[PDB]
């Protein structure tokens, strides 16, 4: 209709004509008006003018928020103390309120840091539980404890909706954009909804990201409470990481109820029902066995043998095909190849000892040592072995106990803040024997031992391993390997300050400095830290031509869910590793078009370092398109390097911190051949 | 669009299948016997125009190197250079062997002119394999199977060829059923009149239709094909080819 008759009804000061012609414009306010509400020139008058305030509040504001206002907009509904399904209530609270509150809530949240924005944010709590429209008031509302409240005065009726919308998209975007003192609500809110709600496995990832006891003991008598069982055993032995499957066996250990708690929380149950789940559905042929088992030579392309042969574990025959097979290898190679019958049994922990029993004690110092080894490698929760291996441990020089401390401290390592080893571990660090594998796998094992701790710690065995770090400035593999278990026990994210006293004290000559990058590097599993990509592209143009391979080496960890930012400009760079950086920044993921893509680019190198490098991440992020870049492998080499690891990736073509740790010590490669007795025993490799 | 979507001739479909998807794949049952011809099937269609044939040769696209030779286009738009570009299409498919060289509307000798002979015996040169092996397999397609001269048939043709049946309506009713599979509209739009509206038409000219039926039933906002509207937009097409 026209405005001539209600048009200069505002202009009079009467109080009828406003008592009247107020709710004429909420009658009329359904549709707004006939235009975009080019009234305020006229109406601007009554700011200053003041029985019936509150709708003429509510008139101003509806105005002002109908045309354009930022600040001024909700001033009239928190001084308005409002009062008195349809279009109108959607048109005025859901539109209008939902950007009203949000940016009430925005310039009150950021602004300070009162009742009234709490009294209005439920007020369209409750509203927009009515209008029901999912993910968008509550995407504006996530910034804005009041989220526990809130997800706890909503979730009532609506599980998979809220639940697996609001929590799957609202968990990428959390741990993508949100930080981490705001998930933390959302653990623990969402170890409320979820713990008094259905599915379970996502609490149990709950369980994954909080690191907690008392989650899989409520898990345990809530899913013991409703009973398939060895699924949520396989992923809940493989969830669960080295704190709480310690814990968790030890209140097992006190408890248990059914003694199916430490049933399936020892290593028996998940392995026991494999062996014939993977015999009986598969059948391997043997031609790989006698091709990849019969091209190999000159002692390297047969530590390739020794390669496939220790990670097979159906057939049997390559393993068991005569004798003389070790004692033509090598040093390194006895000690690869007298693991190799360790890593081959995985299984049958009642003939593992009648097994390896063969190789024990014998008359080769590296044979028994890879036995020992074997016997660490074959299980992880026997830990009967250790007795007559770590018992004696006094060499002092060089004697055979030092390569049974490598297999012993190692194997133990991967079995396992124990310190019935650790006390052990303190001679092995004050040692400092010249062998680097000494202080590689007790400082990886020490590391590994203490991934998972509760905001780490700074005691004295990083206390102590630092002060013998830079005891001695030689032999700088130490201060390489050493930064590595340091940084594994720098896990414990949740702004712990280990990163700060390791920048006050660290701090010193480049190498230290590297072991300080190196922190760096495990210091940043992933938040929103936008500050470490500007400081990122900062130091990426430093001298230093190694913290450049670590440091940019994070990539593939930091980002690691956000693929599609992973792929960037690297390759277009000039320098000597560059190209190594983003090759190692592919990874192991399902290799779609663009990483093959890159490994098209990254195939075709002139450098062994480059070459050898390709074809691990090349066959581990594959896993009639396989063998094709194996056959363009064969088109470019046809030196023993590119040929051993060319067959291995030969095989291997068919956050746990256990998936994340072989490869990045394994970033030191370009080095002797004595790292090849670590190359093959990686337990990352499934 | 793939090749269990369409119905009536899933047994010539599952022959080009069986087919062409016999090398490099499935190798169980192929370097057993040691046969390989390497010169593939060849397709046509009365109907042709690039939709049934490309319905049949979107087989290989499951999982293979996109890469196809529609027809002899670019060979006569461009200068006398020869079987040049034939030359760089096989080194090409040479370092692309995981792929099915695919080619669609051959008029060559249907539509300077001497030079579609000699393009096309060395043509039939190069595709026997004067130099090569069983790398990449050639399907080819036309409007015609009688457009084929007597030459590209002996040394063109060693491996199999089959035959396409004549529409009746049942081809038109399934591509008709895929359009309709998407998109929501009800029976009251008449099949009959509108797949035999001009002569006959499978599937290319009912796609445009199909696609302004989107379009032009999207003017209105209405996601309800009006039983006018649709007719009204096939007149465009109905009076587009029958005026010039």
Redesign the interface.
Known sequence: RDKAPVQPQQSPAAAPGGTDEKPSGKERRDAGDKDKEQELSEEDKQLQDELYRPALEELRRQIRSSTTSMTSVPKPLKFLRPHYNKRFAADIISVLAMTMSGERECLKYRLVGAGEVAKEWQELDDAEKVQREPLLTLVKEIVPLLMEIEQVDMLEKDIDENAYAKVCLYLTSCVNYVPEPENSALLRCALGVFRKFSRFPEALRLALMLNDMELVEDIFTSCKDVVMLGRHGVFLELSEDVEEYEDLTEIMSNVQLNSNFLALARELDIMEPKVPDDIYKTHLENNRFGGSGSQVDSARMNLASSFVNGFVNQDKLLTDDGNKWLYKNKDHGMLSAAASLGMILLWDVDGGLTQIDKYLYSSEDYIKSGALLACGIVNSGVRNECDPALALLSDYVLHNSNTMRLGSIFGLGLAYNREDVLTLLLPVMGDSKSSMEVAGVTALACGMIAVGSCNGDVTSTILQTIMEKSETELKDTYARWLPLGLGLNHLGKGEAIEAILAALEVVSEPFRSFANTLVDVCAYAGSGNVLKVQQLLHICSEHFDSKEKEEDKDKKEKKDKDKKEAPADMGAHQGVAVLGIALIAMGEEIGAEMALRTFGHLLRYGEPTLRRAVPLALALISV??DA?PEVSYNSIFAARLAAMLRQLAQYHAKKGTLTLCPYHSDRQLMSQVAVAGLLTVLVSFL | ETYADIGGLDNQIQEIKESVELP??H?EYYEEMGIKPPKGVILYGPPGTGKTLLAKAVANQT?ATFLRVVGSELIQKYLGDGPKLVRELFRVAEEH??SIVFIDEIDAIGTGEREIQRTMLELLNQLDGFDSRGDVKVIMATNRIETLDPALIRPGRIDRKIEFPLPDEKTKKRIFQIHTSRMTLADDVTLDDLIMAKDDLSGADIKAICTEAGLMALRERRMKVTNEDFKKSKENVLYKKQEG
């Open positions: 009639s398109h094709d | 490099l794949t190798p999982s062997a995981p």
